[PDB]
GROMACS .gro file of C-alpha atoms in nm:
model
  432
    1UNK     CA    1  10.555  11.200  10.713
    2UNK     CA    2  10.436  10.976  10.958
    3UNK     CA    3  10.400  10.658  10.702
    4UNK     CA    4  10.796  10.700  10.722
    5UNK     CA    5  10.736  10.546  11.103
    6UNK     CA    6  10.534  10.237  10.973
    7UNK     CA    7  10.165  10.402  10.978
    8UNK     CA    8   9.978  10.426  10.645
    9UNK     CA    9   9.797  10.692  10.496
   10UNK     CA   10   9.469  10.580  10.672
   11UNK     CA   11   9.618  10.605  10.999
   12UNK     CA   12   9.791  10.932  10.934
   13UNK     CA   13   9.479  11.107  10.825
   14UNK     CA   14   9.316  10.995  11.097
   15UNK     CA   15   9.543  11.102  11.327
   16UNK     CA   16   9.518  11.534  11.245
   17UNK     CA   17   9.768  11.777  11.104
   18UNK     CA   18   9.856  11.954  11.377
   19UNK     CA   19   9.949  11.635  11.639
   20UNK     CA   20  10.117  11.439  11.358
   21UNK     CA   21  10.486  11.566  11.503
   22UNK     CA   22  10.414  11.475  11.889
   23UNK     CA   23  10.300  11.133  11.729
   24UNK     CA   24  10.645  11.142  11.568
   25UNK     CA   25  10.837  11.233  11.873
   26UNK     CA   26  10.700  10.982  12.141
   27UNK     CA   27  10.638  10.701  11.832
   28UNK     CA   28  10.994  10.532  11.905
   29UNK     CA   29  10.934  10.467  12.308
   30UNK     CA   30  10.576  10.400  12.240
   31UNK     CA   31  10.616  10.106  12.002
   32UNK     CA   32  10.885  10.017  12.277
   33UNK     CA   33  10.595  10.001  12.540
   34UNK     CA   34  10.416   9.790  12.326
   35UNK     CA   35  10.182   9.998  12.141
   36UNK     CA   36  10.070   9.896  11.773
   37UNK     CA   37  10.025  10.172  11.549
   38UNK     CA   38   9.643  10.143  11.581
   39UNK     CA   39   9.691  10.215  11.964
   40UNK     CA   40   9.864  10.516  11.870
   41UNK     CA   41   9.602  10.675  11.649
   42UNK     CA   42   9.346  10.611  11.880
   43UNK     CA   43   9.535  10.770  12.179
   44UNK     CA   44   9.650  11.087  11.985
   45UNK     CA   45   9.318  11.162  12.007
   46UNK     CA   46   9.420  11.331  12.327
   47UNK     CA   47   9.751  11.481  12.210
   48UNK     CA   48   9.893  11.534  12.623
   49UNK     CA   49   9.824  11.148  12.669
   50UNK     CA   50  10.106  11.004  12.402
   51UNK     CA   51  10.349  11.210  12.609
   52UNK     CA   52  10.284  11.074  12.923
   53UNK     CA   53  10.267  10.723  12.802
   54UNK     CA   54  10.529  10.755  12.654
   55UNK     CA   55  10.670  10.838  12.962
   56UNK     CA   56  10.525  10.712  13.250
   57UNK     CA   57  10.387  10.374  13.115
   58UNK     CA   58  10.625  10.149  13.316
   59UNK     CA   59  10.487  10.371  13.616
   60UNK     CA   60  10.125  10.260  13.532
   61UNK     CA   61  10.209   9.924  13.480
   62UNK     CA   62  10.355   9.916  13.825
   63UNK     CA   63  10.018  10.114  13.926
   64UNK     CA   64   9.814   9.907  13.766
   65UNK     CA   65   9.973   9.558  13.689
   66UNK     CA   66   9.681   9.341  13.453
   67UNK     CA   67   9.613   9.704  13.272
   68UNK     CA   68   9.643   9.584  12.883
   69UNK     CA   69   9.777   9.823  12.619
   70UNK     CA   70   9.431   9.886  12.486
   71UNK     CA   71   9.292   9.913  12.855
   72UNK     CA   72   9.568  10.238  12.883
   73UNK     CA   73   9.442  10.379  12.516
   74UNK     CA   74   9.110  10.351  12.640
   75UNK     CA   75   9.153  10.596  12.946
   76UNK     CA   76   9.443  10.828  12.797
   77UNK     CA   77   9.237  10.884  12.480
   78UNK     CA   78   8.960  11.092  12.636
   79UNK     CA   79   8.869  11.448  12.748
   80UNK     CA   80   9.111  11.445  13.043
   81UNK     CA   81   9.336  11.216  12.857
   82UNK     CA   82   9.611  11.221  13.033
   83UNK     CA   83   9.627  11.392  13.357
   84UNK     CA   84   9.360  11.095  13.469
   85UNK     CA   85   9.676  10.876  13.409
   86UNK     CA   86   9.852  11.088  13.649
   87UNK     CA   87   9.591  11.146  13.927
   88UNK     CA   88   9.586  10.738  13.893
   89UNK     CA   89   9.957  10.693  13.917
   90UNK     CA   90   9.900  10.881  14.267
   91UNK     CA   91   9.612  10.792  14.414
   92UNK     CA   92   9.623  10.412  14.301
   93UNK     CA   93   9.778  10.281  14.608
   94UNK     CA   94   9.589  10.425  14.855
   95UNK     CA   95   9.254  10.366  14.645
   96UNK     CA   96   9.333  10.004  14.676
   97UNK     CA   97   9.356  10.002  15.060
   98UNK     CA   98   9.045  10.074  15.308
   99UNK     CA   99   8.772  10.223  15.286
  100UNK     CA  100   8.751  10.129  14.919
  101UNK     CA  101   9.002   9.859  14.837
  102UNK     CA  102   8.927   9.910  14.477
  103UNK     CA  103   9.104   9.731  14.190
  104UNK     CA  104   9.229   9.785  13.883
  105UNK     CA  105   8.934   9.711  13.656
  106UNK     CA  106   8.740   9.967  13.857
  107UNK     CA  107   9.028  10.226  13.895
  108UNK     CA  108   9.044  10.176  13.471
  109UNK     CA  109   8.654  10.223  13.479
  110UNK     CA  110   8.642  10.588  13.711
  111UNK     CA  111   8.925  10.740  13.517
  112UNK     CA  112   8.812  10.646  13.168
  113UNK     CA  113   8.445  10.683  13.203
  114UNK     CA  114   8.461  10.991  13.454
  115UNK     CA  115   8.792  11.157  13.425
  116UNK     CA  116   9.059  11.333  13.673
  117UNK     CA  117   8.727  11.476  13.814
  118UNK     CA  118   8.609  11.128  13.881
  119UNK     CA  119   8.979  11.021  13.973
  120UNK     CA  120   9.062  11.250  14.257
  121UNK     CA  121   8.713  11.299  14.364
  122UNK     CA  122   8.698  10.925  14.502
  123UNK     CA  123   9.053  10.960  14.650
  124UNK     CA  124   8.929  11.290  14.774
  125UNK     CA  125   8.582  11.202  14.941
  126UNK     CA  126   8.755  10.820  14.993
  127UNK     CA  127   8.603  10.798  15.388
  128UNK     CA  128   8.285  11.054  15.370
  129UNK     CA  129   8.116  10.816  15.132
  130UNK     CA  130   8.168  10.509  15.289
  131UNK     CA  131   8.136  10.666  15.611
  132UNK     CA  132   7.802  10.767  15.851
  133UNK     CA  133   7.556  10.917  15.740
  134UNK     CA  134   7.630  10.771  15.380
  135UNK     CA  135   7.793  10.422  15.409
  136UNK     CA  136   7.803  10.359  15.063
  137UNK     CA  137   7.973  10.049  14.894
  138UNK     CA  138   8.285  10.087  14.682
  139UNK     CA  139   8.082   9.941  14.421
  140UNK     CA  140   7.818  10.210  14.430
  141UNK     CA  141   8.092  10.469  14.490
  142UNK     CA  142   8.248  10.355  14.143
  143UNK     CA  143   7.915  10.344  13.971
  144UNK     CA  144   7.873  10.674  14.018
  145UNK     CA  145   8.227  10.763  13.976
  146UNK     CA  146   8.215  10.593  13.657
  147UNK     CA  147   8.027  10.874  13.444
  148UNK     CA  148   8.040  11.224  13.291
  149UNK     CA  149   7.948  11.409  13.550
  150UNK     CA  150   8.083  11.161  13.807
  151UNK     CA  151   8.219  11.398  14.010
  152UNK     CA  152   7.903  11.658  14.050
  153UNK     CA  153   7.729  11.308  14.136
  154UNK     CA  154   7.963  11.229  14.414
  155UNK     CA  155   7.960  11.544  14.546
  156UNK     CA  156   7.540  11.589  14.532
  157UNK     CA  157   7.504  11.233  14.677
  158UNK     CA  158   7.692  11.317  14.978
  159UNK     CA  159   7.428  11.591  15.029
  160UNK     CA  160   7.123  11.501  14.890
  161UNK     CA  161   7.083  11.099  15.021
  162UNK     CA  162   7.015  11.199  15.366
  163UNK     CA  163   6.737  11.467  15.249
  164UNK     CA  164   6.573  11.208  15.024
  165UNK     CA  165   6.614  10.895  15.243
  166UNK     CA  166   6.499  11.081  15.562
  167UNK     CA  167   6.211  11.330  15.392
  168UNK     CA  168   6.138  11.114  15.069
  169UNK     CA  169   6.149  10.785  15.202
  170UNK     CA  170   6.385  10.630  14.921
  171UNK     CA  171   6.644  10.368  14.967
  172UNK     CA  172   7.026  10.445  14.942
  173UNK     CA  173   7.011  10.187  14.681
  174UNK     CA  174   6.753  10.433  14.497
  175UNK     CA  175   6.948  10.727  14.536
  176UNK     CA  176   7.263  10.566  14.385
  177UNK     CA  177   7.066  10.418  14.103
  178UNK     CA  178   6.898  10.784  14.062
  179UNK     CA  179   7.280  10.905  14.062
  180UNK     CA  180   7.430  10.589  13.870
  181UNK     CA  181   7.398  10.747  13.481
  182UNK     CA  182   7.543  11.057  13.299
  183UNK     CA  183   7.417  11.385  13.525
  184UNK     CA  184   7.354  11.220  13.799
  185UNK     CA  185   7.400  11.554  14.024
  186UNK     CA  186   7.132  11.689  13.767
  187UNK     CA  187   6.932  11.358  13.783
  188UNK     CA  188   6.898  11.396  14.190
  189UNK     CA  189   6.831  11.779  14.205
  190UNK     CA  190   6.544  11.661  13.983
  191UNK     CA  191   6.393  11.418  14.160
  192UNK     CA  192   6.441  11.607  14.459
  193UNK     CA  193   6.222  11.934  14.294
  194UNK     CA  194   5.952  11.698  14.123
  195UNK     CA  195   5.931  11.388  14.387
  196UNK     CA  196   5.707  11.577  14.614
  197UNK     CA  197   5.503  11.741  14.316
  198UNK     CA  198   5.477  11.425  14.139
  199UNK     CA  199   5.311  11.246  14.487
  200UNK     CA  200   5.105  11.526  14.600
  201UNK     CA  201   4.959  11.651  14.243
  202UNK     CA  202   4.930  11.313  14.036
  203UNK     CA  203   4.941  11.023  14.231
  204UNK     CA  204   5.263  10.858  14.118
  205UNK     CA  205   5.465  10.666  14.384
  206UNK     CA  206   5.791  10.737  14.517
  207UNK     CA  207   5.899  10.397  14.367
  208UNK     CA  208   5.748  10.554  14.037
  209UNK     CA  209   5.953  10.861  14.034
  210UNK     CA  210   6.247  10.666  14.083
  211UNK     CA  211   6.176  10.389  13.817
  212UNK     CA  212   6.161  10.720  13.556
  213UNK     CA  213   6.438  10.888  13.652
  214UNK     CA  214   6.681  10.587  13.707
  215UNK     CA  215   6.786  10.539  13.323
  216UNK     CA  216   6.954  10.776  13.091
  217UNK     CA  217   6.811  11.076  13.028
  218UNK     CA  218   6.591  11.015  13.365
  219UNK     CA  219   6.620  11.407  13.452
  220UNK     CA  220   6.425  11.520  13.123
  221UNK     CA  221   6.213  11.187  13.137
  222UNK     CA  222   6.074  11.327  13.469
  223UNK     CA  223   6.027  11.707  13.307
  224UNK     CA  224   5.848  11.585  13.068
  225UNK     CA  225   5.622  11.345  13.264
  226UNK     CA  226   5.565  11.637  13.426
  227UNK     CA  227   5.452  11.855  13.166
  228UNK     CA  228   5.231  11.602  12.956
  229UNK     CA  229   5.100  11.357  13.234
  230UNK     CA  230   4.823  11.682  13.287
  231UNK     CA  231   4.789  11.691  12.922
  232UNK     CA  232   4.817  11.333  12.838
  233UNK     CA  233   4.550  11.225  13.130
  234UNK     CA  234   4.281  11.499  12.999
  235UNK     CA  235   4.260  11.457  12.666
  236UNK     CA  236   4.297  11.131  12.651
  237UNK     CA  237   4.207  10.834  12.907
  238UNK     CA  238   4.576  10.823  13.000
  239UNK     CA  239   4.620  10.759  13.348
  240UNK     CA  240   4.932  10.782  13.633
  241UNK     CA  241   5.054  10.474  13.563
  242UNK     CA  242   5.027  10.411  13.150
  243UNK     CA  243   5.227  10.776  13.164
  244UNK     CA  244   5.492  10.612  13.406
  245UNK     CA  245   5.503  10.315  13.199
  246UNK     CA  246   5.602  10.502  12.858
  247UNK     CA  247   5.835  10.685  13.075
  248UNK     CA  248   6.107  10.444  13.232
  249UNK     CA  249   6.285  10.307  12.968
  250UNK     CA  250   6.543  10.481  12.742
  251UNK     CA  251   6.403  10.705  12.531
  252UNK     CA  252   6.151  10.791  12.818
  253UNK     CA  253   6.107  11.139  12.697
  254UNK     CA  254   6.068  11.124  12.342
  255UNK     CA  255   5.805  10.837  12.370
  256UNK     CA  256   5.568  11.049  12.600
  257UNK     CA  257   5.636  11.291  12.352
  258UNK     CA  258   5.547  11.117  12.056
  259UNK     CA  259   5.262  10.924  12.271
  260UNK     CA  260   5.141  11.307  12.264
  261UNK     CA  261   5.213  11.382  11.899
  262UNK     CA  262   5.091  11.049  11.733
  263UNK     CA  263   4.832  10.959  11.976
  264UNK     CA  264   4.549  11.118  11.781
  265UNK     CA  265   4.601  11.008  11.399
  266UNK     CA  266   4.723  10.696  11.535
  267UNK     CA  267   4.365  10.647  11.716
  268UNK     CA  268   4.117  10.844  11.463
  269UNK     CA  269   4.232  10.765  11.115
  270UNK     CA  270   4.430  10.424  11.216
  271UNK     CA  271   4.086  10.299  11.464
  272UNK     CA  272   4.353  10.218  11.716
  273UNK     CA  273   4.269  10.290  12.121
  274UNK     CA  274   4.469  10.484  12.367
  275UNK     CA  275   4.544  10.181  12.534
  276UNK     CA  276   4.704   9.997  12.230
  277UNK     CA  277   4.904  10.330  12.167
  278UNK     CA  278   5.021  10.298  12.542
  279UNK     CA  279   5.093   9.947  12.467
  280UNK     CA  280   5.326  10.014  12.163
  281UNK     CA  281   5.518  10.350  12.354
  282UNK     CA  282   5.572  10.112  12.679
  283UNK     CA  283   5.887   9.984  12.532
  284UNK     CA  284   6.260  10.115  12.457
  285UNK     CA  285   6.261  10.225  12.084
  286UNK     CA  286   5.891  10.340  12.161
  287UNK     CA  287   5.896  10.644  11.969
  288UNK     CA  288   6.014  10.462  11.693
  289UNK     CA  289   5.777  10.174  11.767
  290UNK     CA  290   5.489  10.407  11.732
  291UNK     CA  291   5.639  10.591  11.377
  292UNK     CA  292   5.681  10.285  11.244
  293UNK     CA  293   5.300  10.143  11.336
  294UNK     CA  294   5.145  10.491  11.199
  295UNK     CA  295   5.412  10.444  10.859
  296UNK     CA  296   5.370  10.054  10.836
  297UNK     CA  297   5.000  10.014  10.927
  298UNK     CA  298   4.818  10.038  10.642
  299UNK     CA  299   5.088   9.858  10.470
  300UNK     CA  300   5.053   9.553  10.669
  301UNK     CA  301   4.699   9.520  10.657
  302UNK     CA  302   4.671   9.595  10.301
  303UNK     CA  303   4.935   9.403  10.155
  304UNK     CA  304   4.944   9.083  10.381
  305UNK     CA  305   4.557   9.077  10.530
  306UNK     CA  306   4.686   9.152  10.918
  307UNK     CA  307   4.494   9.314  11.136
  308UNK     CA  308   4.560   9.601  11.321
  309UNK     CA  309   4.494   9.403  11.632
  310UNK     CA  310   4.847   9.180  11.457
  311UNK     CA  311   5.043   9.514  11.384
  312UNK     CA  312   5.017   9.613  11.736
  313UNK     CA  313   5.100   9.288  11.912
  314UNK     CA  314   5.443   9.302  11.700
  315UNK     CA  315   5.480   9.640  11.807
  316UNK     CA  316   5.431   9.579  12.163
  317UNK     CA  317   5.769   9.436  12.235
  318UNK     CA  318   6.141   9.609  12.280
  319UNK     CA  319   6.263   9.744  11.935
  320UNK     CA  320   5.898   9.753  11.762
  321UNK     CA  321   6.032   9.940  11.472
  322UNK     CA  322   6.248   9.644  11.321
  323UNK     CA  323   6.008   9.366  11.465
  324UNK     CA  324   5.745   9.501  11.227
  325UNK     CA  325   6.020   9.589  10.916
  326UNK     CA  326   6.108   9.230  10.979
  327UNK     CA  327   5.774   9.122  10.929
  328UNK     CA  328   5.735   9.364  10.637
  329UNK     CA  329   6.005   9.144  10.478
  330UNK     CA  330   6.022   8.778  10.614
  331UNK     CA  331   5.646   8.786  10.595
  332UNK     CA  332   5.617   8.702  10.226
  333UNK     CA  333   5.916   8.482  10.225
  334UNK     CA  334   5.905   8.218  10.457
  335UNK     CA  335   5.527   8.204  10.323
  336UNK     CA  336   5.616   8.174  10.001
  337UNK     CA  337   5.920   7.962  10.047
  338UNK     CA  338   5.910   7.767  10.408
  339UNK     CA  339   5.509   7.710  10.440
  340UNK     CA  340   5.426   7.950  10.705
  341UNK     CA  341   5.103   8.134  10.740
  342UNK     CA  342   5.073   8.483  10.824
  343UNK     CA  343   4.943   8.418  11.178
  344UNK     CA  344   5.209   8.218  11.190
  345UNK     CA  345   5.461   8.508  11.151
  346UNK     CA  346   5.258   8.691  11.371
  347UNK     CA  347   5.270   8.476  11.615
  348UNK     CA  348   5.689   8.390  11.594
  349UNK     CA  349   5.704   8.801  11.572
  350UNK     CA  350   5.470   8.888  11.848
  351UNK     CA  351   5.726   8.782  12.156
  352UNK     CA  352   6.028   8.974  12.364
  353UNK     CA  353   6.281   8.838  12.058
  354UNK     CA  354   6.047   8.829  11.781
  355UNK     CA  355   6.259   9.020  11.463
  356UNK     CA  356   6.546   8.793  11.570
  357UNK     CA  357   6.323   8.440  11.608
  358UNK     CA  358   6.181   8.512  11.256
  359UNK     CA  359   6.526   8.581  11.083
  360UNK     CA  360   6.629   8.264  11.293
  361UNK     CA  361   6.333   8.059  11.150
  362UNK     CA  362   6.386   8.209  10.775
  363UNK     CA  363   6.782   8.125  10.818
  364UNK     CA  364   6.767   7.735  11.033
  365UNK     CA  365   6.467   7.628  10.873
  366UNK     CA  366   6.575   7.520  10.503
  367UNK     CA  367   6.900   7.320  10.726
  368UNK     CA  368   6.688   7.192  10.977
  369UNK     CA  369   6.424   7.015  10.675
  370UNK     CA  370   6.742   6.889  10.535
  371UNK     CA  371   6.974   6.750  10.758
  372UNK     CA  372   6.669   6.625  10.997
  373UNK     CA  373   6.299   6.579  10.881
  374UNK     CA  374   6.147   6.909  11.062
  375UNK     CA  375   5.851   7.012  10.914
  376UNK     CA  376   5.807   7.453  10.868
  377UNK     CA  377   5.476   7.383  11.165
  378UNK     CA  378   5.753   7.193  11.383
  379UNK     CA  379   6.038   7.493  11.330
  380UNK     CA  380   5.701   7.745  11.393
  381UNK     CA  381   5.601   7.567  11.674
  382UNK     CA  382   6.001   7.610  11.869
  383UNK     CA  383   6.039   7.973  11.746
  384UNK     CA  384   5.659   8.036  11.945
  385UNK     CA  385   5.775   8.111  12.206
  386UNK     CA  386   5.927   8.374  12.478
  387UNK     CA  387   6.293   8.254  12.390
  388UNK     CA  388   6.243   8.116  12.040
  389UNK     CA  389   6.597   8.273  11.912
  390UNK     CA  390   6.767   8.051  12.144
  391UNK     CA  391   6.505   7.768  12.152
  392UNK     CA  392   6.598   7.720  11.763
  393UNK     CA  393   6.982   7.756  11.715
  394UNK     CA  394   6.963   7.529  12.081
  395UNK     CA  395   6.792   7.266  11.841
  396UNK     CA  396   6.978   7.305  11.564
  397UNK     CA  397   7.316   7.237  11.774
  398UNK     CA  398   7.197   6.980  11.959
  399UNK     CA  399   6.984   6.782  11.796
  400UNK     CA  400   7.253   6.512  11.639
  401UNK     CA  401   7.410   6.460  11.967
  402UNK     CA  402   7.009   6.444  12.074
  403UNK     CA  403   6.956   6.173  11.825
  404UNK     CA  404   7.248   5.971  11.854
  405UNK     CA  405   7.377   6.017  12.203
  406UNK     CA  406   7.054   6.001  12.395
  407UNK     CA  407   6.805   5.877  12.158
  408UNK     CA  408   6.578   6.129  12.110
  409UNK     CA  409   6.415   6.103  11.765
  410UNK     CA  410   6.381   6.468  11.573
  411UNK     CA  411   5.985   6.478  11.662
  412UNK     CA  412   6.070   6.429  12.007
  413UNK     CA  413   6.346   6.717  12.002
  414UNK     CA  414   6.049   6.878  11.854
  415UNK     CA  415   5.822   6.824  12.139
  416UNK     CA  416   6.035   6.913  12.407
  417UNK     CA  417   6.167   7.211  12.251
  418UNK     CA  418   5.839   7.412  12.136
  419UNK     CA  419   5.751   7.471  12.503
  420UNK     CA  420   5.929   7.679  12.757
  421UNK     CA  421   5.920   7.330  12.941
  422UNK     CA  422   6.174   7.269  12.723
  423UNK     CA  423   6.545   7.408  12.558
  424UNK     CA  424   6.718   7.423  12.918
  425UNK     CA  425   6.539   7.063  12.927
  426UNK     CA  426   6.736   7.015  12.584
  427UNK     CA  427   7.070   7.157  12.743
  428UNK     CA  428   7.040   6.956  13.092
  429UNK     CA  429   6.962   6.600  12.925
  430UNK     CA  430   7.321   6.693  12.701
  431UNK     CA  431   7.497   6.783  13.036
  432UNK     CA  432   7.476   6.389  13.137
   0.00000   0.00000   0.00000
């Protein structure tokens, strides 16, 4: 069927059965638009949409003059397709005038991320929101546009920022960040309930409530701090602020949860403390972070000598999980093959970028010996550091226009590079 019209078999099964023959009947002026096949798949994914391209697209082209092909698939292909397309194709114009004089980029950001909901809502509530008591920005109005749930945000905004700026004492700027991800309207009745409990029963801050509950999944972050802070804070020596810590990042909730779970084998057959568990959840990809030290442990301290003191610094960072798998494997190698010590990989591992500095060492090392005379201490002694990543591949690119351009010798790259007081040093002396 449709591989008769120029898609193959791939794209046809992709597209489904059952919206194969409106795909067939709008392909022709489609195509003529300017859509590729692959545009076409993608957008049938909201059957309504490839009619009103079809249709239409000169209209949003005049509505929306840089909009690219893709930027239209990306829109017309979700939940509300489609009739988005349509409440843009209205309310465009007057969207780009006062209060809001929006533009296209964030007209293509409302509709595609928050839907006709989003769309019309904005048009709708254009003046209240920018208006007394509210006087938001159009760039806070589209970050909270720009969501599922957009819309209930909008509307809760309007009447919960007054009641938490004027009883709560948080900023607008707070409120819209509270608002600002998926559920927002959810996100603010929450912190509206369990501010006030939060403060009066535990201690935490206003600017701590907000800190929890201003990333995804901030609502059920706060529940849960709720729930296990009591918990958390008796049985162990966990206090306010460790419990606020493990809860504002990503993944909030399920690292105070699995702060609760692990907590105890972690500490009694593992000899670690509370504190170093805190340490380890305190990050995004905690939960993992803190699975992965109770599964790799053992593992590291048997099989390479590190201590758990070592397995915890490495674990202490964002994304412990593969920091300490990539130690698990680049461990043995770039000691067997480049030199290195295993403090030495602890070391290169225990910072901010540390999976990605060692896989940068283990990969620029053997090129940096060869084309230059870099010793594995000298590449150990760049990758140290809080950049690292970027202090390496830095050196590595610059270092012949280093030598020969502004005669640096390799030693002295070396110098100024294994620092911190050094790389944008590297980059400004090439900038001359």
């Amino acid at each position: 069927d449709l591989r008769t019209l120029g898609y193959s078999q791939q794209q046809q099964e992709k597209i489904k059965p059952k919206v194969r023959s409106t795909v067939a009947q709008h392909h022709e002026a489609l195509v003529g638009h300017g859509f590729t096949h692959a545009h076409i798949v993608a957008l049938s994914q909201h059957p309504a949409a490839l009619g009103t391209v079809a249709v239409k697209y000169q209209d949003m082209i005049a509505a929306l003059p840089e909009a690219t092909h893709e930027a239209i698939v990306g829109v017309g292909k979700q939940w509300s397709g489609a009739c988005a397309l349509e409440a843009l194709l209205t309310v465009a114009g007057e969207l780009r005038g006062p209060p809001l004089q929006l533009d296209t980029g964030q007209l293509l950001k409302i509709a595609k991320r928050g839907g006709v909901t989003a769309v019309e809502v904005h048009h709708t509530w254009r003046n209240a929101l920018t208006g007394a008591p509210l006087n938001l920005t159009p760039d806070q109005v589209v970050a909270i546009a720009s969501n599922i749930g957009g819309k209930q945000a909008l509307e809760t905004v309007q009447r919960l920022l007054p009641v938490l700026c004027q009883d709560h004492g948080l900023t607008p700027q707070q409120v819209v960040a509270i608002a600002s991800n998926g559920g927002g309207k959810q996100a603010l009745e929450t912190v509206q309930r369990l501010l006030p409990v939060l403060c009066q029963a535990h201690g935490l801050t206003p600017d701590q409530v907000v800190a929890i509950a201003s990333h995804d999944g901030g609502k059920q972050a706060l529940e849960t701090v709720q729930r296990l802070l009591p918990v958390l804070c008796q049985d162990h020596g966990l206090t306010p602020q460790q419990v606020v810590a493990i809860a504002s990042n990503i993944g909030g909730k399920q690292a105070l949860e699995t702060v609760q779970r692990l907590l105890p084998v972690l500490c009694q057959d593992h000899g670690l403390t509370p504190d170093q568990v805190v340490a380890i959840a305190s990050n995004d990809g905690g939960k993992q972070a803190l699975e992965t030290v109770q599964r790799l442990l053992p593992v590291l301290c048997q099989d390479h000598g590190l201590t758990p003191e070592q397995v915890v610094a490495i674990a202490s960072n964002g994304g412990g999980k593969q920091a300490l798998e990539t130690v698990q494997r680049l461990l043995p190698v770039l000691c067997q093959a480049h030199g290195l010590t295993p403090d030495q990989v602890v070391a290169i591992a225990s910072h901010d970028g540390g999976k990605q500095a060692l896989e940068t060492v283990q990969r620029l090392l053997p090129v940096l010996c060869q084309d230059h005379g870099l010793t594995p201490a000298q590449a150990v002694a760049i990758a140290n550091n809080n950049g690292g990543k970027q202090a390496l591949e830095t050196v590595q690119r610059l270092l012949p226009v280093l030598c020969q351009d502004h005669g640096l010798t390799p030693d002295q790259v070396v110098a100024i590079a294994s620092n911190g007081g050094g790389k944008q040093a590297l980059e400004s002396i090439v900038a001359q």
